[PDB]
Amino acid sequence: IPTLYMNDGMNAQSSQALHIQTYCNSVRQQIPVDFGRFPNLRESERQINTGLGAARQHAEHYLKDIQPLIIRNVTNIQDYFETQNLISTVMPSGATKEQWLSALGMVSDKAKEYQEVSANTRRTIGSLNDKLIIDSNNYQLIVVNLNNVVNGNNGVLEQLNRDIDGINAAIDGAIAGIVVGGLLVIGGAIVTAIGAVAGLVTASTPVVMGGIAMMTAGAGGVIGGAIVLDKSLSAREKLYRDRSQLNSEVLVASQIGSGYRGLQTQAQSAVTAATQMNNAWDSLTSELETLNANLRKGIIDDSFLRQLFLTASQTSVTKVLDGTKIIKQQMAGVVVREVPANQSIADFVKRLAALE
């Protein structure tokens, strides 16, 4: 069972990591707000842009310091299972009990080192989640204050925040399912695009923060997922259209707030995936330590270990090794499309849906 927990952990963390990576890129592409036209909104502009700087730093911390740890974890799984296959192919024909005890000791020590890497990753994303919880909650105070400065209706603003939170669940879900479905496609790719979360007006700063599309490309390059994803992206754009009675600068502040909270939502999902991955390494190290103790105590013998390691090599190891190779290629091979300045993310995906 540890090998299947390992495989499920790797698939879930790898697919989620691509989603939070794209989300982070959307945060880093958000232009600072400009309330230059309204002099007594200067303090609200500074607070929001201070917030956006902090959000950009959190996104950069994920991209630069955490994503490489998730890829490393996949390499560690590969190296663990290659070492397990080495044991399985060299030791059953002739290895002594002494050699089996050393093998279990040395492979348990390597698994424990990989487990500790997974645990450091979990703690690092846990700390980032915690800072994002604090910062995204404090950010919402700025939006309420700005709504008060312009004598806005706080019931309309709260109804918009509740609606966007609701639709963000659907968008997050649709994207999670698209990336899960594409992760293990041989020769396939993940295609990404960043754009405005609401309809664009030529004559209000556009907000691309959490304005993401993720789709699949097969071996032949043909896009999948745009039709699926188009329903929720258009829904978000429609919920913002239905509150164009709200103050324009409040709307922008609110959209950045939903983006900041959405970045925290992604970080929470990354904690969950990292916890599942650490728990899967724990089950593997626990098994290997138990085998080592059981052999030393004469509760199992070399014949038991021959059976276990020959069966392991022939049953679920090949699927995990194939996965590590496909996952590394997919994570290195993400395709970015540039969205034209006059297309929202929903307009861009709708044009792709029309072609699928």
Numbering used by the authors: 3 to 205, 208 to 360
The authors write:
As expected, soluble SmhB folds into the family observed β-tongue structure, with a five-helix bundle tail (α1, α2, α3, α6, α7), and a head domain containing three α-helices (α4, α5, α8) alongside a four-strand β-sheet (β1, β2, β3, β4), which includes the β-tongue motif (β1 and β2). The head domain of SmhB is largely hydrophobic. This is particularly evident in the β-tongue and helices α4 and α5, which together constitute the predicted hydrophobic transmembrane region (G175—L233). The crystal asymmetric unit contained two closely related monomeric AhlB molecules (RMSD Cα 0.56 Å) with the only significant differences in the tail domain, where α7 from chain A folds as a single helix with a kink at S320, while in chain B α7 is divided into α7a and α7b by a short loop region (T319-V321). AhlB and SmhB use both a short β-strand and a short helix connected by a loop, while SmhA uses only a short loop perpendicular to β1. The second region is between the N-terminus and β-tongue, which includes a family conserved glutamine (Q38 SmhA, Q32 SmhB, Q45 NheA) on the N-terminal helix α1 that forms hydrogen bonds with the β-sheet backbone of the β-tongue. In addition, both SmhA and SmhB contain a family conserved (conserved in all but 1 sequence) lysine residue at the C-terminus (K333 in both SmhA and SmhB) that forms a hydrogen bond with a conserved hydroxyl (T81 SmhA; T78 SmhB) on helix α2. As the overall structures of the soluble and pore forms of SmhB are almost identical to those of AhlB (RMSD Cα 0.64 Å and 0.46 Å, respectively),, not surprising given the high level of sequence identity (62%), we investigated if these structural similarities also conveyed functional similarities. The B and C components interact at a binding interface located around residues 95–123 of SmhB, this could break latches 1 and 2 on the B component, releasing the β-tongue, C-terminus, and N-terminus to initiate the transformation into the B component pore conformation.
